[PDB]
Enzyme design. Sequence first.
Site, PDB file in Angstrom:
ATOM      1  N   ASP B 181       0.825  -1.212   0.000  1.00 28.64           N
ATOM      2  CA  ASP B 181       0.000   0.000   0.000  1.00 28.64           C
ATOM      3  C   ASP B 181       0.854   1.255   0.000  1.00 28.64           C
ATOM      4  O   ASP B 181       0.653   2.133   0.832  1.00 28.64           O
ATOM      5  CB  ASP B 181      -0.909  -0.029   1.217  1.00 28.64           C
ATOM      6  CG  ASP B 181      -1.980   1.087   1.214  1.00 28.64           C
ATOM      7  OD1 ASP B 181      -2.456   1.436   0.116  1.00 28.64           O
ATOM      8  OD2 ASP B 181      -2.340   1.521   2.326  1.00 28.64           O
ATOM      9  N   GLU B 432       3.309  -7.941   7.244  1.00 35.57           N
ATOM     10  CA  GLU B 432       2.032  -8.511   6.830  1.00 35.57           C
ATOM     11  C   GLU B 432       2.169  -9.624   5.793  1.00 35.57           C
ATOM     12  O   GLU B 432       1.412  -9.672   4.811  1.00 35.57           O
ATOM     13  CB  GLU B 432       1.142  -7.398   6.291  1.00 35.57           C
ATOM     14  CG  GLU B 432       0.786  -6.394   7.376  1.00 35.57           C
ATOM     15  CD  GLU B 432      -0.304  -5.416   6.904  1.00 35.57           C
ATOM     16  OE1 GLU B 432      -0.480  -5.220   5.669  1.00 35.57           O
ATOM     17  OE2 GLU B 432      -0.942  -4.863   7.803  1.00 35.57           O
ATOM     18  N   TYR B 492      -7.089  -3.210  12.632  1.00 35.15           N
ATOM     19  CA  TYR B 492      -7.957  -2.127  12.169  1.00 35.15           C
ATOM     20  C   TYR B 492      -9.394  -2.396  12.523  1.00 35.15           C
ATOM     21  O   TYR B 492     -10.298  -2.164  11.711  1.00 35.15           O
ATOM     22  CB  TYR B 492      -7.789  -1.909  10.673  1.00 35.15           C
ATOM     23  CG  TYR B 492      -6.416  -1.353  10.299  1.00 35.15           C
ATOM     24  CD1 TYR B 492      -5.319  -2.184  10.040  1.00 35.15           C
ATOM     25  CD2 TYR B 492      -6.211   0.012  10.235  1.00 35.15           C
ATOM     26  CE1 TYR B 492      -4.075  -1.654   9.715  1.00 35.15           C
ATOM     27  CE2 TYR B 492      -4.993   0.546   9.937  1.00 35.15           C
ATOM     28  CZ  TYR B 492      -3.913  -0.280   9.660  1.00 35.15           C
ATOM     29  OH  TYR B 492      -2.729   0.307   9.348  1.00 35.15           O
ATOM     30  N   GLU B 527       0.567  -1.010  13.935  1.00 35.29           N
ATOM     31  CA  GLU B 527      -0.338  -0.202  13.112  1.00 35.29           C
ATOM     32  C   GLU B 527      -1.737  -0.276  13.670  1.00 35.29           C
ATOM     33  O   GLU B 527      -2.178  -1.335  14.116  1.00 35.29           O
ATOM     34  CB  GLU B 527      -0.456  -0.693  11.657  1.00 35.29           C
ATOM     35  CG  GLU B 527       0.831  -0.563  10.865  1.00 35.29           C
ATOM     36  CD  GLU B 527       0.649  -1.018   9.416  1.00 35.29           C
ATOM     37  OE1 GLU B 527      -0.523  -1.055   8.931  1.00 35.29           O
ATOM     38  OE2 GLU B 527       1.661  -1.340   8.769  1.00 35.29           O
TER      39      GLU B 527
END
Lengths: 620, 620
Positions: B181, B432, B492, B527
Amino acid sequence: NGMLYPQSNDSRIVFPLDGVWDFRTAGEDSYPAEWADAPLPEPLPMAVPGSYNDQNDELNLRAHYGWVVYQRSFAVPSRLVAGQRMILRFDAATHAADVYLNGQLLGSHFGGFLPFEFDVTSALHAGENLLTVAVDNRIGSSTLPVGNDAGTAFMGSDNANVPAVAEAKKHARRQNLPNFDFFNFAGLNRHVELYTTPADAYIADIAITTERLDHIAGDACTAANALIAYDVTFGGDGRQVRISILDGEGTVVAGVTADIERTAKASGEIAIRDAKLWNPGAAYLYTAVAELLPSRIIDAYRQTFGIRTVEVSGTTFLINGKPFYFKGFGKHEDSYFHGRGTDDVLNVKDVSLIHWLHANSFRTSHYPYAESMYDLCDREGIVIIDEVPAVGMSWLQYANPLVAERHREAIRGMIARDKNHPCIVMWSIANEPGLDGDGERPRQAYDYFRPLYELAHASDPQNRPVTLVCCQNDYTTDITERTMDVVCINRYYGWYNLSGDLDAACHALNIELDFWENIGKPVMFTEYGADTIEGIHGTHGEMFSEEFQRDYYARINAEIDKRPWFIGEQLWNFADFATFQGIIRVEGNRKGILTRDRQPKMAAHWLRERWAGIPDYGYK
Amino acid sequence: NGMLYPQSNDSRIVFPLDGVWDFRTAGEDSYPAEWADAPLPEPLPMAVPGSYNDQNDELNLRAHYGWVVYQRSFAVPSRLVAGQRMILRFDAATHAADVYLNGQLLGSHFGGFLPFEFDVTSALHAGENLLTVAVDNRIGSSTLPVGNDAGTAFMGSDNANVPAVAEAKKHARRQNLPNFDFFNFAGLNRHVELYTTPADAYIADIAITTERLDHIAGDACTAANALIAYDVTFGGDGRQVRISILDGEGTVVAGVTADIERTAKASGEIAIRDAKLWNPGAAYLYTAVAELLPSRIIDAYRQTFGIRTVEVSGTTFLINGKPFYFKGFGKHEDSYFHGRGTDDVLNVKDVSLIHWLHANSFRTSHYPYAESMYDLCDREGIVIIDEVPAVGMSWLQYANPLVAERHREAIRGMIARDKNHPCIVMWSIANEPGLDGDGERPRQAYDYFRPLYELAHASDPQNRPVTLVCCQNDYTTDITERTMDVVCINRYYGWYNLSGDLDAACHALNIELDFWENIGKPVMFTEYGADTIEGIHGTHGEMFSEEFQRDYYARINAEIDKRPWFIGEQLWNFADFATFQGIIRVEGNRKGILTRDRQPKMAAHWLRERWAGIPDYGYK
Ligand SMILES: O=C(O)[C@H]1CNC[C@@H](O)[C@@H]1O
Ligand SMILES: O=C(O)[C@H]1CNC[C@@H](O)[C@@H]1O
């Protein structure tokens, strides 16, 4: 007087001193001189080159008034320095600086946009050296650019008749109040470097000029014959210098050996057959290689140049004999974190945007730019109007001899630095000084500027045209602008007056254009524009919308297209930029056709389509 | 294996090659090799260092796929290359490069974020040298970072079942498709320089380690005694090297002369009484000066270091024996015009903003950063998690031997470059990767990553903790993350799932924290965050508003404060940054607590107040 950019070759080496330096803020009117004797106490980090103001968010360095102190250490091998002349060069220290090396004061400089250097041969020593640079940001009634000694910054708001305001002003923290519409970014804005030359004899300055073109091709790409002249100055102490002219591919196309005569100089001319000319939109560059002769070479310097002539004739502006039309804008050296700090990534990007827009020119509003930008415009075929930092001036300055001396210094320094660039076609000796009015004011302004106009002409071996950029004023009492070689006008009809009424704005503009029609000089805009916030839209665009900005240029440009003697359109501004805070500046000046991050507003797209259809030569 | 940053001293000089180079785009799969034999035809300007993608708005260099070619000329005095070993260093060419000097292929390199160098002693010659560098931006299933060979980029939209889409894909222009990303910025992202060492015998590598601390002060500012160790590697060819330890004032506090033994190495230990320790928020640096002896000095190198221990103990992370709590974020090397290009003005500003925020740490997401940033964080007391570019990996990569070798190269190369920084406390071997699922997939991932965990531990003389940054996943079938020294999770809740519902997000979070409570490792966020457009506001903030971003951290942080084993909060991201275009990226990734121009959103102010009240040591 020569300030050739430092070069590395078999005779010379440059040792850059950029990077992360140590830094401390200091006092309003003093700094500790003992800081030059030992490492700074509890230093902050500060990258060089860059303005310091936006490099620390724990402190409010935009509010700083007075001195700061930079410092770093460096070492170079004894082999590098042995037998050589060692020069420490500051490309720019804004505005004034005191420089120390190993505790020794080398000297001081005033003028925040032009380079200065010191001979450090005897001050250097082996091992680590300690370089301390105190930099003063203060501006006021005797600086260029001009600061205000009291009151407000330029186009600031006040309620001066309120007693509480008058009293609080007396005890307010001292702050620089620019009499100019850009933020007073300060510090080591441009590169610092140590360089070497030979000590016994060395090349000190080179001037190349285009003397004459014979039989220029119809498309101006070539001339049957070009007569160029060279002028080399030497320092140090039957000696000779070899001058070789290299074309675009590195091929030596001409060569001569010249005698050095005594102040040591070598001078002469060279004829270049089928010379490839430098033009807007079609750059071509030669290199003049000067080699000081004893087999061996003693010293060498490679000076880029371009072959082209510039001549004002009647109401035309002739480049290589062709009638040129300026398309472009004033710029600024301004960007987010760097401030006024030089950034070549951004210069490269900006020159590409100039091409994307189909513009061909800009002005260095309102100070000489970093040297690398002129080299870029040399190779990219973009014309420059080169301007000294004489912004904010009025009758208070013209009566001040210290200002006149600083003004002469800036003009001589700019032209000495920049004379060899083919991209520079015109000099600007001031932006928006006071020129109009009654009584003796118009004549006082004229008597101040006429000698500087003559100075710019005397200083430039190419003898390019000289202008003064004129603020919106009573053009009928200004007697100075109409005596310039090109009349350069800033006009904001429909923005700062007749606000939002484009019909009235165009009527007003035509009334003034009728005035200039009778004067008989070539005329161009150097500024016109409208603050515009990207993303503000309307079906009938009002002031600050993207549509109004587009309509502004569409209406105004239709009127100047009807005037054959109007030879250029430079708008304000290329891109939004920072200013002192105030009620008319929304995060700075927003008259950019690009945002501060270089993104195009609606007007930029419109202008791109307009400029795509306007030729560099023969539009009028 | 040693990559000491080039240094200038009495025995060594550095010659920078940064500036405005020549540049041309080339083909998808090829470039003209004859471009190395002569100046590039019709070149564009391109500033170095910097990504090339945002340096030309006439071309669409963000869309470019394949090769570009950089070139410049340079010349140095023969007096200073004579007798010396000449090394040409690329701090980073992204992603792959072929390097030619005077037509001769010096060699090639693949990792885009780590430095490489060539011995050019024999390819240099007097006068102008021509340096040509072909750079390949292509990414795919065999690169690190990983690209996708077909389909979409990371979190791209598709309608794969529409026959017209399937057919159009077969003929669409080839484009890099990041499986990560962030935008695939390419080019000479970091500095290029030529440097010299002595040729017969020279210092090749230095490793300083903190071996033991005796009687650490209660405030961790000092220890009664510190044992450090040195390991110096030499190249070239009863020899000796003097090691001097300089404290912050330059005083030589300790010193030893060690015997050099055959690969030529010297190693030992040095006791430092009353040692001043490096801590987050309270940096202290020593210098290890290594001098190769023949009164004269043959060679020298000055290596900064800091004295501190790092140890994971149960569910604590101990620096100098004190329980540390991470406050900070993932970053990116990303900015408007530079792209991924290094910018020391921006590094200096960013470190000041870390201080403004009262943060103490960041992660180098998702690639090693420029060497200068670690030097800055050493001096400014900011802790780093150092991460290799192993992002976008899944089972397709784990069986690819080319990928495995590139992954080992990046781990060894990062630790070899960065081992001496006291600010680095932990290594991250991937971001990740795919770790969960059914069947053999969890075991396949474990068998791929476990040798890399061991490699990182074997490569680091300090033996710092090693982690892998885990994506939001089925933590019950992931068997790899729980075996790391510190569990680093990206989560998230409330953004990519349970969207907008902070009560449900906190409930889900607490269920997962209950799982990690039983694992018994120290756990931290690396994160968590929410895309936020500055200026979007609501009284009950919804996703993309400034208020939602503030409420998001307020709610999530209240839950982790209840867990004593949760040792750190690194959010995503420090600042908004560029990505490949797509339907979930509004001018890039907007999870920054700062805007891309480093301005604070509402959540940054809230976090600043929270972090002001949280100590580096002893929060839990
Ligand atoms: O008012 C403006 O926008 C401009 C007026 N002429 C001078 C410029 O520096 C200034 O920025
Ligand atoms: O989705 C996101 O915002 C982040 C998820 N974790 C990986 C980051 O690179 C990415 O930017």
